[PDB]
Design a binder for this molecule. Sequence first.
Ligand code: HEM
Ligand SMILES: c1ccc2[nH]ncc2c1
Length: 462
Amino acid sequence: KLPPGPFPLPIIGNLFQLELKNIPKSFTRLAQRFGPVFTLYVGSQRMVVMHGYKAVKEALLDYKDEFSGRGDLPAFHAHRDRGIIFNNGPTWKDIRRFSLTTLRNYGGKQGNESRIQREAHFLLEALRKTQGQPFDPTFLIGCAPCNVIADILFRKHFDYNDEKFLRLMYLFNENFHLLSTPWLQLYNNFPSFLHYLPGSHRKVIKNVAEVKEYVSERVKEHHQSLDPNCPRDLTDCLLVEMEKEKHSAERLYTMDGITVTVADLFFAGTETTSTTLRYGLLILMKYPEIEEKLHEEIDRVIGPSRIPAIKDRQEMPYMDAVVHEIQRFITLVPSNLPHEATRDTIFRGYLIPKGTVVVPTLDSVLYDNQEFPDPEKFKPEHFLNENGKFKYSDYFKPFSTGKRVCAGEGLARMELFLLLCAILQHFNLKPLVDPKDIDLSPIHIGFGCIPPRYKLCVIPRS
Ligand code: HEM
Ligand SMILES: c1ccc2[nH]ncc2c1
């Protein structure tokens, strides 16, 4: 007994029920019609969508092992079943677990804060270097989290002007962008009919292969000078783990597997944080009054010169709330990443067969209209008690939750606080249009929500 849903058509299933430019909106439309759990056929493939905190929470937390699979994403077939993001195989569990331990060992530790704090040095330099002229913040702000993850992964630090640096960011940006477009949405559910026609899916595929090749080469480089006594980074810690298991019959790690793990952490480690920061700057420019309040709190708690520290969050409730509100407001990965039933499952009273794609929607949660009155409006007080202290919400789920929760959550959240603190400590944001004319709406919705392209100026405070 499948969850209720619209009557599918031959070949295309439910494609008339879906607006490809705005799948999250189609999902919301379908939840009004059929309730919090529903069935869809997108092409021949069956999915069940959960919509709203209760349904999304049950799916991700009560049936953790049942939905701990990962739905196929054809554009990233080069990663499928290797690493962590795109694998629905036996190898997922211990590669994930090991990566998380290594990530954590590399930073509570204060290695993460320090690492972020020292990148803020280079980020702040680049912004001063624009000397108050208009600039596209895309490939400037983006260097910050990209270097931070490069330190952990490769022991590698890049100049902001360096050629392969800018190119890797370009490809990350292009992929996140194109994956959020309607042609790619159609491609991921009809890959066999469409794969060999021309179109943007081919750019994504080429792009994925280029990043993988760049990673691959850094990995083999790491092999050729690996000191098993003295691992330099996460890429090393994975090499060490592969060669402890030389004699083993069953292999957890391959050289292909590790490059995928690294290519994963490199892409995810860079793109979502950069997009978040970039969106956050555009929002703060739409509400001059919010930036002002931020400036006074930074001047009061930290002052004009002392490098922001994580221990400042407790004492900066307005900043803390704004940072949460940026992530809640932009719903950056608004349908989550797709899950799948590892087993024939009984959810509520419905059968969800093995290998049904399961979509525990995140925007439906982050935009709950009772948890967050006026959820469509940007409001720091969505995360502030009436007496002005930071207010926690169980609805703040932008990193998802459960078995497949974002592997970089700790890092990302630290980065957003400390980098946004740093930027506002030293700079005023200057929009090139009137704050009233700024349209905050995503220009593409799919895999992510993509901000409009814009230029701005930053005007030094110190
Ligand atoms: C603002 C920044 C970020 C946001 C909004 C974000 C969001 C997400 C979401 C929604 C998922 C899917 C979870 C699920 O399937 O239930 C995910 C997974 C993942 N993230 Fe993030 N993320 C961010 C930053 C990062 C960073 C910095 C890293 C690198 C350490 C990272 C690495 C990963 C990996 C490897 C996965 C796949 C988890 C798995 O499939 O087992 N992410 N993220
Ligand atoms: C793709 C791009 C950015 C990401 N952050 N977390 C998972 C992820 C995947």
